[PDB]
Amino acid sequence: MVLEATVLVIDNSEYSRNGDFPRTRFEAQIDSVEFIFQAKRNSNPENTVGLISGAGANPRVLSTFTAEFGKILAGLHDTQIEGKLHMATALQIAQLTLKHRQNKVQHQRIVAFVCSPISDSRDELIRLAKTLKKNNVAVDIINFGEIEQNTELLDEFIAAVNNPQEETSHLLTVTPGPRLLYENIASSPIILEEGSS
Amino acid sequence: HPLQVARCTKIIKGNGESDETTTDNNNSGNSNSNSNQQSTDADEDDEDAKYVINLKQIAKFVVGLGERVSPTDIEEGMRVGVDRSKYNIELPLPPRIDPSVTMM
Amino acid sequence: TGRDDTKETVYISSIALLKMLKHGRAGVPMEVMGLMLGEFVDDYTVNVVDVFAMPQSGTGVSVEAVDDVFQAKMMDMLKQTGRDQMVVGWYHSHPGFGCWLSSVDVNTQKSFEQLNSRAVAVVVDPIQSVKGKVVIDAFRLIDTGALINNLEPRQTTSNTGLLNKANIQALIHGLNRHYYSLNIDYHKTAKET
Amino acid sequence: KAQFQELDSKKQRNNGSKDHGDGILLIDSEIARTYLLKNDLVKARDLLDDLEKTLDKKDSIPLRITNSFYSTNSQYFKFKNDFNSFYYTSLLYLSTL
Amino acid sequence: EQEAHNKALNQFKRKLLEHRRYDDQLKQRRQNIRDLEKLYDKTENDIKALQSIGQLIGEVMKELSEEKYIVKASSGPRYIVGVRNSVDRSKLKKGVRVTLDITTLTIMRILPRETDPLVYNMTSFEQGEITFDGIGGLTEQIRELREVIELPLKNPEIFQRVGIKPPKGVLLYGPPGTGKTLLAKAVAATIGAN
Amino acid sequence: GDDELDQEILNLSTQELQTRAKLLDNEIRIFRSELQRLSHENNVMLEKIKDNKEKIKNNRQLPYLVANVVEVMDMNEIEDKENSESTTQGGNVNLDNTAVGKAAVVKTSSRQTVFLPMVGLVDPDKLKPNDLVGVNKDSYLILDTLPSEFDSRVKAMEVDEKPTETYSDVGGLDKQIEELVEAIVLPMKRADKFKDMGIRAPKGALMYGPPGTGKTLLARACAAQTNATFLKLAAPQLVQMYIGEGAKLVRDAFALAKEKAPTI
Amino acid sequence: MSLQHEKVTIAPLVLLSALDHYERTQTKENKRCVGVILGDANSSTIRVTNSFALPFEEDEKNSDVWFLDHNYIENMNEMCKKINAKEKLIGWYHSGPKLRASDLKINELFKKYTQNNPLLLIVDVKQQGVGLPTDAYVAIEQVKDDGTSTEK
Numbered sequence A: 001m002v003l004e005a006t007v008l009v010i011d012n013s014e015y016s017r018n019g020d021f022p023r024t025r026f027e028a029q030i031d032s033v034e035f036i037f038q039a040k041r042n043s044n045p046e047n048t049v050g051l052i053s054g055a056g057a058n059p060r061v062l063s064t065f066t067a068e069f070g071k072i073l074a075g076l077h078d079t080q081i082e083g084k085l086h087m088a089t090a091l092q093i094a095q096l097t098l099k100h101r102q103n104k105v106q107h108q109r110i111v112a113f114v115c116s117p118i119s120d121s122r123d124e125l126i127r128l129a130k131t132l133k134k135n136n137v138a139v140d141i142i143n144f145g146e147i148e149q150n151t152e153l154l155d156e157f158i159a160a161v162n163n164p165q166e167e168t169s170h171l172l173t174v175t176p177g178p179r180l181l182y183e184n185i186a187s188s189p190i191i192l193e194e195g196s197s
Numbered sequence B: 001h002p003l004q005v006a007r008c009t010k011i012i013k014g015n016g017e018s019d020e021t022t023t024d025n026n027n028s029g030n031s032n033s034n035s036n037q038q039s040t041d042a043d044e045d046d047e048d049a050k051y052v053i054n055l056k057q058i059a060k061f062v063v064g065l066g067e068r069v070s071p072t073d074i075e076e077g078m079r080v081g082v083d084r085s086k087y088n089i090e091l092p093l094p095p096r097i098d099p100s101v102t103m104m
Numbered sequence C: 001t002g003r004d005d006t007k008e009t010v011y012i013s014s015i016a017l018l019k020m021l022k023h024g025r026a027g028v029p030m031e032v033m034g035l036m037l038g039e040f041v042d043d044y045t046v047n048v049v050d051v052f053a054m055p056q057s058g059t060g061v062s063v064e065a066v067d068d069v070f071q072a073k074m075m076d077m078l079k080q081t082g083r084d085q086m087v088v089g090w091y092h093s094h095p096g097f098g099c100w101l102s103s104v105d106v107n108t109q110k111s112f113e114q115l116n117s118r119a120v121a122v123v124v125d126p127i128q129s130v131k132g133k134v135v136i137d138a139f140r141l142i143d144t145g146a147l148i149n150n151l152e153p154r155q156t157t158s159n160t161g162l163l164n165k166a167n168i169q170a171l172i173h174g175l176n177r178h179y180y181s182l183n184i185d186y187h188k189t190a191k192e193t
Numbered sequence D: 001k002a003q004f005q006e007l008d009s010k011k012q013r014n015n016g017s018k019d020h021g022d023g024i025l026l027i028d029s030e031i032a033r034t035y036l037l038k039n040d041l042v043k044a045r046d047l048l049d050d051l052e053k054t055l056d057k058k059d060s061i062p063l064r065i066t067n068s069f070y071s072t073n074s075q076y077f078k079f080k081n082d083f084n085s086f087y088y089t090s091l092l093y094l095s096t097l
Numbered sequence E: 001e002q003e004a005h006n007k008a009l010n011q012f013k014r015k016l017l018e019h020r021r022y023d024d025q026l027k028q029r030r031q032n033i034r035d036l037e038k039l040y041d042k043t044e045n046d047i048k049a050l051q052s053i054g055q056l057i058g059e060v061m062k063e064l065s066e067e068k069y070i071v072k073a074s075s076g077p078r079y080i081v082g083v084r085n086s087v088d089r090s091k092l093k094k095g096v097r098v099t100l101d102i103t104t105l106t107i108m109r110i111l112p113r114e115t116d117p118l119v120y121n122m123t124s125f126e127q128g129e130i131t132f133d134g135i136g137g138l139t140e141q142i143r144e145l146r147e148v149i150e151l152p153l154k155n156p157e158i159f160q161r162v163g164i165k166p167p168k169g170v171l172l173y174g175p176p177g178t179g180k181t182l183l184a185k186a187v188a189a190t191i192g193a194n
Numbered sequence F: 001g002d003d004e005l006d007q008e009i010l011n012l013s014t015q016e017l018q019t020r021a022k023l024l025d026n027e028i029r030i031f032r033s034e035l036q037r038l039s040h041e042n043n044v045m046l047e048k049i050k051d052n053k054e055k056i057k058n059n060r061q062l063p064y065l066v067a068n069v070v071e072v073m074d075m076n077e078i079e080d081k082e083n084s085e086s087t088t089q090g091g092n093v094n095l096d097n098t099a100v101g102k103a104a105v106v107k108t109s110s111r112q113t114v115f116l117p118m119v120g121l122v123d124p125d126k127l128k129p130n131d132l133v134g135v136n137k138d139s140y141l142i143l144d145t146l147p148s149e150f151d152s153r154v155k156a157m158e159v160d161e162k163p164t165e166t167y168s169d170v171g172g173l174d175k176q177i178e179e180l181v182e183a184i185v186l187p188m189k190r191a192d193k194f195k196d197m198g199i200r201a202p203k204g205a206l207m208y209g210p211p212g213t214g215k216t217l218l219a220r221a222c223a224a225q226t227n228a229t230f231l232k233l234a235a236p237q238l239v240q241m242y243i244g245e246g247a248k249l250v251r252d253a254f255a256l257a258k259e260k261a262p263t264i
Numbered sequence G: 001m002s003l004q005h006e007k008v009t010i011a012p013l014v015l016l017s018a019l020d021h022y023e024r025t026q027t028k029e030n031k032r033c034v035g036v037i038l039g040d041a042n043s044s045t046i047r048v049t050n051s052f053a054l055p056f057e058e059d060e061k062n063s064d065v066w067f068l069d070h071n072y073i074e075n076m077n078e079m080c081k082k083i084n085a086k087e088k089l090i091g092w093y094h095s096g097p098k099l100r101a102s103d104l105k106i107n108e109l110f111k112k113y114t115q116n117n118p119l120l121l122i123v124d125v126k127q128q129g130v131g132l133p134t135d136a137y138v139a140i141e142q143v144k145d146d147g148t149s150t151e152k
Ligand SMILES: Nc1ncnc2c1ncn2[C@@H]1O[C@H](COP(=O)(O)OP(=O)(O)O)[C@@H](O)[C@H]1O
Pocket: F169, F170, F171, F172, F173, F210, F211, F212, F213, F214, F215, F216, F217, F218
């Protein structure tokens, strides 16, 4: 989306250990994190992107808004790769990042990859959905990590956040096996996704 | 005024003095350069003939080139005016009280 | 007429007093530079809330002795923490000499006058101070037009009129042809005490 | 032990993270452990003291790593029948479980 | 031909050079990270020196008190200074060389006793020295010099035990050319004394 | 002959080589991410240095005082418990910051003796007894190094080599000419043979006999040929009434000779 | 690494700065002022020489959410070495007076700028204690007795 700031979440997990894209899902995610960053810059050049960890109980800020690809790239290697995603904590820590920004003319976007299903209670994300859309924050969930064998708990959360205002949630369905992850991003909306009026 | 009066006791060239000492050796730097072969970290310094003056309280200082004359005019054994505390040649003074004395 | 041209009561907070002494005493035998950040209110009241030290300069105190890279960056950091205030003056030391402005320091005051025309210049000796009341005086320029036509004094109205002064030397010569001195007033609460 | 020493020459570089040296120390507790049962107690002792050294220069030491170390140390003491030396070592094993 | 792996291989040939090139570069770039590091530390060490600042030397002229010393500054005037927590008063004594912070004029640390440049030239002399054992001959004479000199320096323990006074002083005299210098040069190595 | 071509069809199977190739495309993707990572790191790191450099450039700038290094005293790292100082601080190992290890003591031309923390800018190997040094005017820190100046006393004594006079032009006295060649040139040129053998090259040759027998002409010829400097020293001068002054120039001439060595 | 923090000397600059800094963010009602403290560390005596604010948020809904700006800590380091190289990050003040368990996790963050364990300097700005205007604690990791786990 044009005129948007985005907090990437790299999923650090033991389902990211598991290989379902080359070399493993972690090495797949380096390539897809580079993809989105540049695509979004071209479409609007004021766009600027941070990175935070999906690891442990606490997500840590690896990068703040920046348009050097090198600062975001560096954090992908540095972070510990074995962890667990915690969606609830992520939404809130991502939201703080979207608070503290160069100009709030931009849309508040969270793009969050899923390799590992939720490790938290369902209902907490339902309550948090209404707080997110209250400040006009949307959350894009890339799902290849809950359709392996998992039933999709993701869909109901996207329903709750979605409501046209200026920002609308999307659910990027990505096939679960090798095809290269970056390409799956590309075939899903990622330069034509938008918030609706 | 006041320019405290000093006098040149040495012509030490500016590219032979080795002001830079990170990659330069004391004997000379290049003899016409000192840090013009370094532009990898951005530091600039060349100058030609910086002189060592001797103050009349007998303190020695490396001082500037002329800032109101060309350095050609400033020589070995020539008196010079330098600032109160910024010690940098502004105006040269004649080389001593020698005229008129000699001519008689 | 025009400007009030009466010399400010400078209210230096406790934090700002101790901070100045800290940077000055480490740096002896050398000069130190720095910018004073506060709020100006009334027509003669400046409250110097905080300070920041400008790194040690290789040419000493002068009109080049603020680098615009440090300055901009430093104020930018105060803006991210809400500690932001406006440059209302500048401080500099003479490390071995009592309070006065040399030719260079007055010329620096002419530059700070441009930016804020109520600006203060504070001269801190770090080592001569054993009380810590002493050898800290603030100066502020009185208009040039004021000097010529002899409308120079106008600092004795709208103050206490208790003055504290000593020395002829440079101090006094500085005073006659340029600036006016007034004591440093210390502000505190009972939480700092 | 060969696999992991080999592995970190490549892996650390490509991956850019992850240390596999944690696991070396359990293997090492187990080499002493083999020595204990075979009745070469003397050999096992030296390898446990060389293990201990590595532990101290680690910033974070997970509980599992030091748990095995103490298990081994416990076995050593009861062969001598030093009741006191076994008792004090076993409490730490129990706590760090 | 009939193969499409024959068509594939042409392309695969181009690829080959690419791996080699990338490997060359990776190895260079790590070495570069290290090289810039050393340069960076050293630039930063100048800056630690600018904030550390010089110090003043004097000498303890006379002890006034444990916590007060008469020092005579090199700059000029005699001073009464304080003693820092850091310098111990066991180190302080009269006539020892001292150094002090410029700031508060408080004794920072003591100095070792400095040497005038005349006597430095004498000390500095070393030719890389010689053996015992390249002074050969007049064996018995070499042995006795060792008996006076070397024997109480290494072992004063035997001399204290017996309760005899340490033996000290030797005078050497002989013809020119006999190697008093050669022996002077030799004895100095053997024992290792300054 | 290489790899990934028709040579390899014979070494390794057509299916197996082709599937190697696909594997080796993956390896590029991994190489690119690593390579860029190392690249962006150098670039970033480079900027930090430029920042520092500029800070030092202001200090390096004129004026600055001139001092001379009396001696160097570099203290040991860990002289104390954890300090390169000779006093206690509870830790920190530094050479010019919290703890002073290396130091140079300089004597100013302002008549002061000052103990300085060594500055990282210069080498401890340049800093000798009487190295002329630039020192920062304000706070005193060794800023830079300067060549040594030499007095008029130094000048007379030293190098007054004129190109070879040539022995053809010093007529007669065949034997004297024969002796000088043997004494000087043969060791200087054939030093390698003297070295392998371990014998010493002549300490002196005494020349004696009445004035005007050519001797001057000859040493001046020999010195240019042998590529040693010509020093001019005359003993009747060095006899003085002042004990100090008279002793001084012997000591000066010995130190300067060894310096300007090889020298005649 | 060292476990050396046995004595903590405080300059009075630190206690009045923490008093100001709370009020320059305007944190209240168990919101906190989290900033850095600089000084010397890796040593038996710690001298807490200086203090600065950092950008920081504190959420009352869950204590495992707070904000911190990392880029601020990296940029403040460059600047402070120029003023004084004897100043380095030695840990963090926290307004308190209540010490919490989530503060262990903030602690971990600060362990990536200083080699030693970070010092968490509780400075009460509310002035409820008539003594202790400084209490100091350091996070250490040890097997706790009585069948208890390894606790941080
Ligand atoms: N063998 C010679 N052939 C030519 N002229 C000579 C010869 N020896 C001496 N002279 C002349 O006499 C001068 C004095 O001799 P010089 O080499 O200076 O001697 P000494 O060291 O013996 O006092 C020479 O400058 C030269 O004019």
